[PDB]
């Protein structure tokens, strides 16, 4: 039911709309979206995250949102605040609160909701809204990126699913939506040993910095492989992760 | 068109029909299937692998089968021999040989083919036939496992996607097809540093040996994380991998 003029009126209140994408794999996409959100929240900024990933609700898992209940006020759908930084969150998972396990939704029962979440949710005047797009460069992340009309785009890949085609493909999509790639994050680019500190490229060297230099992306960072990170992300305590790779 | 009496007549010629499965992820399932096949081939046994994974043709990638061409003789569909051990291989990918990139097929256009590959392919008197099932414990791997009527089942998981439910679920499926779980392989259970040799459980400790002890699985092995393995598997040279974790 929601219309463009309604979505535009809502989103306009948001100063920054950063969409996060990745190749078909999408490995680390969501975790990177939370880490980014936590980066800004910890800076004293008002952060909000929208879940648009058809393939399982990662975000609500990373933040341990088991409560997952949707409420509605005069301003619209009420987002669930994160337990530690009060980051606003909206996910498909919240539609069935009494479910203790993640449930994959249908196909068309997503495209519409994402639009309704973009315009009928009370995000408020938060200055940063991260949209966790569904993995891949297909039409799924294209429609979401269009309705969201981001103010910037961030690409998340790995030493294996990171090529100049995935990036150029993201460079096109960014223009096909009056936006642009602002950053590139290479996930699990390497592993630093906790005993002697030696570096190992388990998945190989992603050479993510080269591509960031090729198309001169304004920002680039390589997050490493860490027993802790993975351990916290799975137990839904990413907010407790005491490391900031975006700084 | 193929019928049960035709599939049974073919498979009967095969002494061992080992089906390989895993949780929704299926991470390492295929690579483990090749490593196993290479284990037997290197032992001087006649090995054959059937590709039944709806989600991308891993096997033909692991063995670098770019040629990927299907031929037909008086005995039926001719399998493609591996470049080094002459392991017979049949995959959906071989239907479109002139394609230099893997293409994901539809849904119903798979269930039928797998049956046709099980009975109209010239496997011969090979004593080991490994079926690479599609990931998960859903109906997809159920129908394949029924037509294949394996003589044994192997479960492949990781320190995160390895639970007593996935295994018990595999214990049921095995009985629902007059078969049984013969082994359990834990993939990427740990990483051994090449500098000081210290062990790290990046994805956590899978405790795969505990489960193998719980339901007393006859076989269990933990394959580690290795820069080489991954590097060879991606470049389609798993046959050159000089390590045998099944012994
Ligand atoms: Zn070390």
Q: Nearest CB to A227: which of B194, B202, B230?
A: B202
Alpha-carbon distance of A201 to B194, in angstroms, equals 11
| HEC sequence for chain B | CCCHHHHHHHHCCCCCEEEEECCCCCCCHHHHHHHHHHHHHHCCCCEEEEECCCCCCHHHHHCCCCCCCCEEECCEEECEECCCCCCEEECHHHHCCCCCCCCCCCCHHHHHHHHHHHHCECCCCCCEEEEECCCCCCCHHHHHHHHHCCCEEEEEECCCCCCHHHHHHHHHHHHCCCCCEEEEEECCCCEECCCCCCEECCCCCCCHHHHHHHCCCCEEEECCECHHHHHHHHCCCHHHCCCCCCC
- CB contacts, 8 Å: B195 with chain A: 193, 196, 198
Alpha-carbon distance of A133 to A177, in angstroms, equals 14
Residue A203 CA, ligand 1 centroid: distance in Å? 17
Alpha-carbon distance of A66 to B168, in angstroms, equals 26
Beta bridge partners of A247: none
Beta bridge partners of A77: A72, A121
Alpha-carbon distance of A82 to A65, in angstroms, equals 8
Kindly report the number of other CB atoms within 10 A of residue A18's CB atom.
22
Alpha-carbon distance of A22 to A35, in angstroms, equals 16
Kindly report the number of other CB atoms within 10 A of residue B140's CB atom.
20
**A29 neighbors A156 (Cβ within 8 angstroms):** yes
Alpha-carbon distance of A173 to A180, in angstroms, equals 8
Task: Show Cβ contacts of residue B33 under 8 Å, excluding neighbours closer than 6 positions.
Answer: B20, B49, B59, B130, B132, B156
Annotated binding-site residue? B91: no
Among chain B residues, CA nearest to A198: B195
Residue with tokens 């949710």: A121
Question: How does DSSP classify residue A9?
Answer: H
- CA dihedral sign, ordered B200, B205, B208, B209: positive
Kindly report the number of other CB atoms within 10 A of residue A152's CB atom.
16
Q: Which domains are seen in chain A, by residue range?
A: 1-247 (3.40.50.300)
* A74 inside 8 A of chain B by CB: no
Q: How far is B62 from chain A (nearest CA, A)?
A: 15
Q: Residues 9-38, chain A: which have Cβ within 8 Å of B?
A: none
Residue A186 CA, ligand 1 centroid: distance in Å? 23
Among chain A residues, CA nearest to B160: A234
């Amino acid at each position: 039911r929601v219309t463009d003029e309604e979505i535009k009126e809502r989103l306009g209140k948001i100063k920054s709309r950063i969409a996060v994408m990745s190749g078909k794999g999408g490995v680390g996409k969501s975790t990177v979206t939370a880490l980014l959100a936590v980066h800004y929240a910890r800076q004293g900024k008002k952060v909000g995250i929208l879940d648009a990933d058809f393939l399982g609700p990662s975000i609500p898992i990373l933040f341990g949102l088991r409560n997952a209940r949707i409420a509605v006020s005069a301003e619209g759908l009420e987002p669930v605040l994160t337990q530690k930084y009060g980051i606003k969150v909206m996910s498909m998972q919240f539609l069935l609160p009494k479910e203790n396990t993640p449930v994959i939704w249908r196909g068309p029962l997503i495209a519409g909701m994402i639009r309704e979440f973009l315009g009928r949710v009370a995000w408020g005047e938060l200055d940063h809204l991260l949209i966790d797009l569904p993995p891949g460069t297909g039409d799924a992340p294209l429609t979401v990126m269009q309705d969201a009309k981001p103010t910037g785009v961030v690409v998340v890949s790995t030493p294996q699913e990171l090529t100049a085609v995935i990036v150029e493909k993201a460079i096109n999509m960014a223009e096909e939506t009056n936006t642009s790639v602002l950053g590139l994050v290479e996930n699990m680019s390497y592993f630093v040993c906790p005993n002697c500190g030696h570096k190992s490229y388990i998945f190989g060297e992603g050479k993510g910095e080269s591509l960031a230099k090729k198309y001169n992306i304004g920002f680039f960072t390589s997050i490493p492989i860490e027993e802790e990170l993975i351990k916290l992300a799975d137990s839904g305590r990413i907010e407790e992760y005491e490391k900031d790779w975006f700084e």
